[PDB]
Enzyme design. Structure first.
Site, mmCIF file in Angstrom:
data_model
loop_
_atom_site.group_PDB
_atom_site.id
_atom_site.type_symbol
_atom_site.label_atom_id
_atom_site.label_comp_id
_atom_site.label_asym_id
_atom_site.label_seq_id
_atom_site.Cartn_x
_atom_site.Cartn_y
_atom_site.Cartn_z
ATOM 1 N N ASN A 90 0.948 -1.112 0.148
ATOM 2 C CA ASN A 90 0.070 -0.203 -0.023
ATOM 3 C C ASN A 90 0.774 1.163 -0.159
ATOM 4 O OD1 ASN A 90 -1.810 2.093 0.575
ATOM 5 N ND2 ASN A 90 -2.341 1.541 2.617
ATOM 6 N N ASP A 189 -1.719 2.959 -4.263
ATOM 7 C CA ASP A 189 -1.904 1.609 -3.303
ATOM 8 C C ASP A 189 -2.930 0.651 -4.193
ATOM 9 O OD1 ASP A 189 -2.875 -0.141 -1.426
ATOM 10 O OD2 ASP A 189 -4.587 1.210 -0.816
ATOM 11 N N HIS A 345 -10.098 1.844 -10.277
ATOM 12 C CA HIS A 345 -8.583 1.283 -10.985
ATOM 13 C C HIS A 345 -8.865 0.351 -11.894
ATOM 14 C CE1 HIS A 345 -5.338 2.138 -8.042
ATOM 15 N NE2 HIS A 345 -6.297 2.164 -7.197
ATOM 16 N N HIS A 379 -5.241 6.112 -10.021
ATOM 17 C CA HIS A 379 -4.943 7.344 -9.828
ATOM 18 C C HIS A 379 -3.874 7.691 -11.037
ATOM 19 C CE1 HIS A 379 -6.368 7.456 -5.728
ATOM 20 N NE2 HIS A 379 -5.815 6.328 -5.432
ATOM 21 N N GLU A 404 2.270 9.676 -7.854
ATOM 22 C CA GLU A 404 2.066 9.150 -6.484
ATOM 23 C C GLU A 404 3.275 8.976 -5.823
ATOM 24 O OE1 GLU A 404 -1.508 7.133 -5.002
ATOM 25 O OE2 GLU A 404 -0.519 6.866 -3.166
ATOM 26 N N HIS A 406 3.541 8.377 -2.218
ATOM 27 C CA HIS A 406 3.064 8.251 -0.739
ATOM 28 C C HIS A 406 3.861 7.848 0.187
ATOM 29 C CE1 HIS A 406 -0.979 6.795 1.476
ATOM 30 N NE2 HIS A 406 -0.115 7.721 2.018
ATOM 31 N N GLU A 449 -1.701 11.712 -3.133
ATOM 32 C CA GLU A 449 -1.022 11.448 -2.017
ATOM 33 C C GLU A 449 0.481 11.803 -2.333
ATOM 34 O OE1 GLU A 449 -2.707 7.479 -1.134
ATOM 35 O OE2 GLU A 449 -3.444 8.441 0.444
ATOM 36 N N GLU A 525 -12.309 10.634 -2.040
ATOM 37 C CA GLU A 525 -12.342 9.444 -1.744
ATOM 38 C C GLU A 525 -13.201 9.319 -0.409
ATOM 39 O OE1 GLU A 525 -8.548 7.094 -1.374
ATOM 40 O OE2 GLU A 525 -7.993 8.379 -2.986
ATOM 41 N N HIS A 528 -15.071 4.115 2.718
ATOM 42 C CA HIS A 528 -14.324 2.869 2.141
ATOM 43 C C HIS A 528 -14.882 1.546 2.497
ATOM 44 C CE1 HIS A 528 -10.136 0.861 2.666
ATOM 45 N NE2 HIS A 528 -9.946 1.840 1.773
ATOM 46 N N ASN A 585 4.069 -6.950 2.408
ATOM 47 C CA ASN A 585 2.867 -6.637 1.522
ATOM 48 C C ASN A 585 1.797 -6.165 2.323
ATOM 49 O OD1 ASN A 585 0.876 -9.006 2.507
ATOM 50 N ND2 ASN A 585 2.999 -9.932 2.362
ATOM 51 N N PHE A 589 -5.374 -5.367 2.051
ATOM 52 C CA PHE A 589 -5.969 -3.879 1.883
ATOM 53 C C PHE A 589 -6.089 -3.445 0.625
ATOM 54 C CE2 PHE A 589 -5.430 0.492 2.182
ATOM 55 C CZ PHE A 589 -6.573 0.937 2.975
ATOM 56 N N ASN A 592 -11.157 -3.266 -1.377
ATOM 57 C CA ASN A 592 -11.962 -2.523 -0.850
ATOM 58 C C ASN A 592 -13.030 -2.166 -1.871
ATOM 59 O OD1 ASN A 592 -8.660 -0.394 -0.882
ATOM 60 N ND2 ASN A 592 -9.589 -1.911 0.542
ATOM 61 N N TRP A 983 -9.198 2.281 8.895
ATOM 62 C CA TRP A 983 -7.813 2.096 9.469
ATOM 63 C C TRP A 983 -8.037 2.765 11.023
ATOM 64 C CZ3 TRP A 983 -8.362 3.602 4.587
ATOM 65 C CH2 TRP A 983 -8.657 4.955 4.368
HETATM 66 MG MG MG Z 1 -1.515 5.745 -1.604
HETATM 67 NA NA NA Z 2 -6.401 -0.183 -0.564
#
Ligand code: MG
Ligand code: NA
Ligand code: MG
Ligand code: MG
Ligand code: MG
Ligand code: NA
Ligand code: NA
Ligand code: NA
Ligand code: NA
Lengths: 1007, 204
Positions: A90, A189, A345, A379, A404, A406, A449, A525, A528, A585, A589, A592, A983
């Site tokens: 992620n 992610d 995505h 993204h 990105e 992040h 991000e 976003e 979730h 990993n 996650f 989603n 989270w």
């Molecule tokens: Mg990210």
């Molecule tokens: Na995710």
């Protein structure tokens, strides 16, 4: 040269970016978007060989096929072919953070293809190769001579091969690097894969050619007149006899056409662009484009000579629409939008990151069918066809740069660094140059991000300058920086603030009114949807509708990023992070979505469809008031169906045509509703049905629904008292009750009903006991990579280890029944968590009434649920109930459900989330039937072949095994599921079981 | 109130009386109350009440019990929110503790009489020889709800014989966002349909 370790080198010999071309040599073909003989696909079987580093690649390969290679299909992700593993991480980069270096062991994919080129293509003009998507960087050779290099895995890289090919057979060799300095800008992610995963094609253009074209549409005040402006640029030799003709068509009718020689207006002291021209076409009463009515025209751009010889033609679909922010609101054709969006995505469970037309269409139709009107390209720029489908089916799109970073520390380390400005700049500019003519794109995004850095500000201004027609948004650095026209947070809550330092996430309602703030707010976003989620969705919708400047958001996200793997016996199963040997990993996650990887919907999709409805309803008396939320169309494909039922028993129903103008209202008066035959609650359910099929739906599609309770006639009649009286047998070990063919046994040491018999048949596998826990949901677990997590709290408090202690177990005989009283305490390490007091009253009619009064220590974390459970001995085919349904529903996710009589096969009562957890609950149930059993009251329940214990011990759905019998969980109370994020604690206070004392009552009897 | 059921059962250490009543209007059933009174060898009387309220009738002002006690005592002692009058949507200022005031302080002399003096979140109430224990709201005074409703000015109220005790499992909020339209927030309206409460009455 190690070009793949130098952000100053993002390409070599690459051609300029530009909108989609086909170089038609027939204008009619261009008009109808027919395939072009000048745009050839090189997709199909290629030769491929894998190496561990570029240094391991043999020079021979450049000139000749490696006999070790395999033949594989292209486009593809090499991971999907088993060459190396895909990695699911992620935030943390998959490679050591040491920009701009990458590991020395760097998976290298060597692709090659032997193909024919006809002399005709080489006798004249230019032949270029186009690689729509190569992950992450690559070098290209043709006939053994090096051609060029490219980066940015999500935009096309084009090279001129005119000087490298020969008639007949030719050989391309593409060396693709898994990691490069471009990977530092691709930390999304998602699974990290690589390869030539988008189309490869060859395009022939004449020497004198259309090299770029931009189309704009401007309107008068009421949109009754427009001017289409088309700027065209050419390359090749300027000659006075050249001309450009731009023609506009609506279907088969030509609306307008204009022609001009090249030569643009004066720009500055040095003149103008002699290689460009702008054609302007007036259009009266244009049919406007929107997601509601995606009206499209076709613009055909012809490059030709004055004598009338066509040189070539290019074209595009045109949607007449204006996008502007005014007075704090985002307007589409002058009206304020309400974004019912989703992030999506590019993911396929079998093909990885390779997209195909069928999947794209499937996603858009499900989106539309579920009341979505917009999509965010999270993204990175998508496969080109996505935009054409969005333009034609009608979806609003957020086009986002593939940037990105992040995992950097702090997040803006690179984006605030001028040395990274060039690389970032190409990610934004090439996206704009490619996608600027698509009407479906309404907003540009700078990426995701990557904190907030000066690079962002520079690029935000660049876009504002080159394309004033669309707002620019960016959420990094706090969601409301100088690089965004729209406040676009991720996971900001409705009412609750999350005041993180520097980058707080205010409640959305509050955010709009902070001092000096005036922009619209649309969450990039929200909600979730990981696992059993979407709890509190309705709260967002209520706020979006009440607050003008809250214009919606993009749910996170459309589809689970699970991949298919095969078991020892070859059966497929859904895999996630770590299942390929990938480490580190981020486990589940990556899943989603609102839909499973195969597009089957999760239960949350229906909650989203209902909350995203386009018609609002109010009831007053016998009057239903329908209001349309459409901005542009009338309800010309809609009828309202109404039904009234008594406890699931159908009383009456009708149909009325709906004729509501956009934003209008319609009053419908229901007919006299003449007295119900018996006691109970009358319920009204209305459904909006589309009688005619459309491009995105079938005839009969239901687009909206709502229910209300009508009159209730409480039952005041008594029960024709028992022909008999049950008999009690007392023994030190048990209290046994017998009535006709039934028998109930209460164990005196445990204090629970341990067995039940009908005739000679035992009804229970495990005794009926209180239950205060649940197999934790993803949201309960709360991990995206917190001792405040509900699961942690429960475990820490001993909720899952608590043992019941018997405080009292007694029997009493009444005039018509037997009454058992028990009391138990659940303790942990000396702490009394919960106390359950009950009475069981078995009467002459054979019914067992159970009354339960639970006390919860105020200082233990509020429990996940308050109910009973047991494992029934029987396995029945159907589940029938009177309550909310038909799909799974929870306290904070039950609005889409309807109160009615539902009957499903047992299996549908189980929701196969990939990562197993508590699931399948149905709330507000007053009657439940299964096999010979019937339970009545006001409870929530789940019923399946899997116990809570098993579900909490199992990581993957494929490893679940049905247990003997049927596990029944019946709850008086159940905690909400949350989901504002996955989270942190996300269950709103109103859905927490914090009352201290709970009471519920169940009636168990036979059928 | 229309009696639906009334029975008595003898148990090992108690007497159990069960009842059921329907409140109707013009034929419409507004509310159903089902109760059990369990009197044990200890002299304690446990009352368990389960009420059903018609979904289509306006949400009720309260769900409780009332009676007029023969006793008139000087003090009122309780373990709950206080010391001053407090209602569901107006009790943040009240504190949970043991309070003891003179009976008249349990009356609020609004110039225009109405329901008044409630105390919420009460776990035990003491008056004269009696004790009530549970999780309830209550008011106690020398004036019946009927008198309060029928009298326009505080000075005209007269003490009735005895003491009127209103013990509620639930009580609607009082509102006030404005005083000329419905102003009680949804969350303080008694709309749950089904309500449960329990009280223990004893002497000592
Ligand atoms: Mg990210
Ligand atoms: Na995710
Ligand atoms: Mg480079
Ligand atoms: Mg042809
Ligand atoms: Mg040859
Ligand atoms: Na709004
Ligand atoms: Na219609
Ligand atoms: Na699990
Ligand atoms: Na009065």
């Amino acid at each position: 040269r190690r070009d793949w370790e130098n952000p100053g080198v993002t390409q070599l010999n690459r051609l300029a970016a530009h909108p989609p071309f086909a170089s038609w040599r027939n204008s009619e073909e261009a008009r109808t978007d027919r395939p072009s003989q000048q745009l050839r696909s090189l997709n199909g079987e290629w030769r491929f060989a894998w190496f561990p580093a570029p240094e391991a690649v043999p020079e021979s390969w450049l000139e000749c096929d490696l006999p070790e290679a395999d033949t594989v299909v292209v486009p593809s992700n090499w991971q999907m072919h088993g060459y190396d593993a895909p990695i699911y991480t992620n935030v943390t980069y998959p490679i050591t953070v040491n920009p701009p270096f990458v590991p020395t062991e760097n998976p290298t994919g060597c692709y090659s293809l032997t193909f024919n080129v006809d002399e005709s293509w080489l006798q004249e003009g230019q032949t270029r190769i186009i690689f729509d998507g190569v992950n992450s960087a690559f070098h290209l050779w043709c006939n053994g001579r090096w051609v060029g290099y490219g980066q940015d895995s999500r935009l096309p890289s084009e090279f001129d091969l005119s000087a490298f090919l020969r008639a007949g057979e030719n050989r391309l060799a593409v060396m693709v690097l898994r990691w490069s300095d471009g990977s530092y800008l691709e930390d999304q992610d998602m699974w990290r894969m690589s390869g030539i995963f988008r189309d490869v094609s060859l395009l022939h253009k004449p020497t004198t050619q259309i090299s770029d074209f931009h189309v704009a549409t401007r309107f008068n005040d009421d949109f009754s007149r427009a001017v289409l402006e088309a700027e065209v640029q050419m390359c090749g030799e300027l000659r006075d006899y050249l001309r450009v003709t731009v023609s506009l068509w609506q279907g088969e009718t030509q609306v307008a056409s204009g022609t001009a020689p090249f030569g643009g207006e004066i720009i500055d002291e040095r003149g103008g662009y002699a290689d460009r021209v702008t054609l302007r076409l007036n259009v009266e009463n244009p049919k406007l484009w929107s997601a509601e009515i995606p009206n499209l025209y076709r613009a055909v751009v012809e490059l030709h000579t004055a004598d009338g010889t066509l040189i070539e033609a290019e074209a595009c679909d045109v949607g007449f629409r204006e996008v502007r922010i005014e007075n704090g609101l985002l307007l589409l054709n002058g009206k304020p939008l309400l974004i019912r969006g989703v992030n999506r995505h590019e993911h396929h469970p079998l093909h990885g990151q390779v997209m195909d037309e069928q999947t794209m269409v499937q996603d858009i139709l499900l989106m539309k069918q579920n009341n979505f009107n917009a999509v965010r390209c999270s993204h990175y720029p998508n496969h080109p066809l996505w935009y054409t489908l969005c333009d034609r089916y009608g979806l609003y799109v957020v086009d986002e740069a593939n940037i990105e970073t992040h995992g950097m520390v702090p997040m803006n380390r690179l984006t605030d660094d001028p040395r990274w400005l060039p690389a970032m700049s190409e990610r934004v500019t090439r996206m704009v140059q490619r996608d600027r003519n698509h009407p479906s794109v309404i907003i540009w995004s700078l990426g995701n991000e990557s904190g907030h850095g000066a690079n962002h500000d520079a690029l935000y201004r660049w876009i504002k300058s080159v394309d004033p027609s669309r707002p620019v948004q960016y959420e990094g650095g706090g969601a409301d920086t100088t690089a965004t026209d729209i406040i676009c947070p991720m996971y900001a809550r409705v009412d609750e603030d999350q005041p993180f330092p520097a980058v707080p996430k205010w409640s959305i309602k509050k955010w709009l009114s902070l001092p000096g703030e005036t922009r619209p707010l649309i969450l990039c976003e929200y909600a979730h949807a990981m696992g059993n989620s979407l709890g509190g969705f309705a709260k967002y919708w209520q706020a979006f509708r009440q607050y003008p400047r809250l214009q919606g958001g993009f749910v996170w996200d459309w589809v689970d990023q699970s991949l298919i793997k095969y078991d020892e016996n070859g059966n497929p199963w859904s895999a996630y992070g770590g299942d390929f040997g990938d480490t580190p990993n981020d486990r589940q996650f990556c899943m989603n979505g609102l839909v499973f990887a195969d597009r089957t919907p999760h239960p949350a999709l229906t909650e989203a469809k209902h909350q995203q409805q386009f018609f609002q309803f109010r009831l007053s008396g016998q009057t239903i008031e329908v209001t349309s939320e459409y901005l542009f169309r009338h309800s010309d494909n809609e009828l309202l169906h109404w039904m009234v039922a008594l406890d699931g028993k159908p009383l009456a129903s009708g149909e009325v045509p709906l004729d509501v103008a956009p934003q209008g209202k319609q009053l419908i008066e229901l007919p006299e509703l003449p007295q119900p035959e018996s006691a109970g609650q009358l319920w009204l359910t209305v459904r909006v049905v589309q009688p005619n099929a459309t491009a995105w739906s079938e005839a009969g599609h239901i687009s909206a629904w709502q229910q209300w309770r009508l009159a209730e006639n409480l039952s005041v009649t008594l029960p024709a008292a028992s022909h008999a009286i049950p008999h009690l047998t007392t023994s030190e070990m048990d209290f046994c009750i017998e009535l006709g063919n039934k028998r109930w046994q209460f164990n005196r040491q445990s204090g629970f009903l341990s067995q039940m018999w009908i005739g000679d048949k035992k009804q229970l596998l495990t005794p009926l006991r209180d239950q205060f826990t649940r197999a934790p949901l993803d949201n309960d677990i709360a991990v995206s990579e917190d001792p405040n997590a509900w699961v942690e709290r429960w475990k820490a408090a001993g909720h899952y280890q608590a043992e019941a202690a018997l405080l009292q177990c007694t029997a009493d005989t009444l005039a018509d029944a037997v009454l058992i009283t028990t009391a138990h305490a659940w303790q942990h390490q000396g702490k009394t968590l919960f106390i359950s007091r009950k009475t069981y009253r078995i009467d002459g009619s054979g019914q067992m009434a159970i009354t339960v009064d639970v006390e919860v220590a105020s200082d233990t974390p509020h429990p996940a649920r308050i109910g009973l459970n047991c494992q029934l001995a029987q396995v029945a085919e159907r589940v029938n109930w009177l309550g909310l349904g038909p799909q799974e529903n929870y306290p904070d996710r039950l609005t889409a459900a309807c109160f009615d009589r539902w009957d499903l096969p047992l299996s549908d009562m189980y929701t196969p989330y990939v990562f197993p957890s508590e699931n399948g609950l149905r709330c507000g149930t007053r009657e439940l039937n299964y096999g010979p059993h019937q339970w009545r009251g006001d409870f929530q329940f789940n019923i399946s072949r899997y116990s809570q214990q098993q579900l909490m011990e199992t990581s993957h759905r494929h490893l679940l095994h049905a247990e003997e019998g049927t596990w029944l969980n019946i709850d008086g109370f159940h905690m909400g599921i949350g989901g504002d994020d996955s989270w942190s604690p996300s269950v709103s206070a109103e859905f927490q079981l914090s009352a201290g004392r709970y009471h519920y009552q169940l009636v168990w009897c036979q059928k």
